[PDB]
Amino acid sequence: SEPQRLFFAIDLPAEIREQIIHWRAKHFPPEAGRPVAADNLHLTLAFLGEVSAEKEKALSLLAGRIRQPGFTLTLDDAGQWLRSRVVWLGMRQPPRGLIQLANMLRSQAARSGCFQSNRPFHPHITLLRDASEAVTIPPPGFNWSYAVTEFTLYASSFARGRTRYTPLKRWALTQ
Ligand SMILES: NC(=O)c1ccc[n+]([C@@H]2O[C@H](COP(=O)([O-])OP(=O)(O)OC[C@H]3O[C@@H](n4cnc5c(N)ncnc54)[C@H](OP(=O)(O)O)[C@@H]3O)[C@@H](O)[C@H]2O)c1
Ligand SMILES: [Cl-]
């Protein structure tokens, strides 16, 4: 049909999402920035931008040929990027498989003509947007650790008053 704004990402188990939003509400007032909805919390692997249906099929076939074992993410880091005006969660030492997976999807995107910045992959989970002022960043909560078993292609849209990330396809990682 019509083109969509697409990105590949890793999702978070519902319980960890709940812990994150509780932690965020505890540590950041509304004025700190605009909260990412619980269901929209994710770790982007590759951003594709606007993509026709034909190109989406092509990239989906490429993603489907990726053979990457699963890995575990332990979110032990938080920070703020003032240039992007985001507050994020992350991993001090991401597993090699995460980097490998993101690098493959980014290369596939770039080869298809998708704008990739030459910027190095910086894995993160955005918690607050429009965080234009420096705020104290506490460490994340305890034991936000989980096994990643798959990755997903999402469509991004703004409908009503809300950002919506819609899952289109998923691919298991080898476990
Ligand atoms: N009033 C309005 O009309 C309005 C207002 C706001 C948003 N919107 C729309 O609603 C959606 C919200 O946008 P969004 O910012 O929530 O999501 P988005 O712009 O669709 O991006 C989705 C994900 O891709 C990442 N990303 C974007 N460019 C990238 C790049 N060059 N390299 C690596 N990663 C990249 C973002 O990273 P980060 O997580 O680091 O940002 C984000 O996690 C968009 O479709 C936007 O057009 C509309
Ligand atoms: Cl959101």
Author numbering: 2 to 176
Give sentences copied directly from the paper behind this entry:
Another product analogue of the reaction catalysed by LigT, NADP+, was also trapped in the active site, being well defined in electron density. In the NADP+ complex, there are 4 monomers in the asymmetric unit, and the nicotinamide end of the ligand binds to each of them differently, having different conformations or being disordered—depending on crystal contacts. The adenosine 2′,5′-bisphosphate moiety in each monomer binds identically, however, and in a mode highly similar to that seen in 2′-AMP. The 5′-phosphate mimics the next phosphodiester in an RNA molecule, and it can be used to deduce further binding determinants for RNA substrates. This phosphate moiety is bound by Arg6 from the N-terminal strand β1 in the crystal structure, and it is likely that this residue plays a direct role in RNA substrate binding also. In the NADP+ complex, we actually observe unidentified electron density of a stacking interaction, modeled as a fragment of NADP+, on top of Trp82, which could reflect low-affinity binding of some moiety in NADP+. The orientation of the reaction products 2′-AMP and NADP+ in the active site indicates the direction, into which an RNA molecule would continue, considering the last residue sits in the active site.
The 2H phosphoesterase superfamily is an ancient group of proteins and protein domains characterized by a common fold and a few conserved active site residues. E. coli LigT is a 20-kDa protein that exhibits 2′,3′-cyclic nucleotide 3′-phosphodiesterase and 2′-5′-ligase/phosphodiesterase activities, but the biological function of the enzyme is unknown. As in other 2H family members, the active site has 2-fold symmetry; this symmetry also includes the 4 water molecules at the bottom of the active site, connecting the active-site β strands through water-mediated hydrogen bonds.
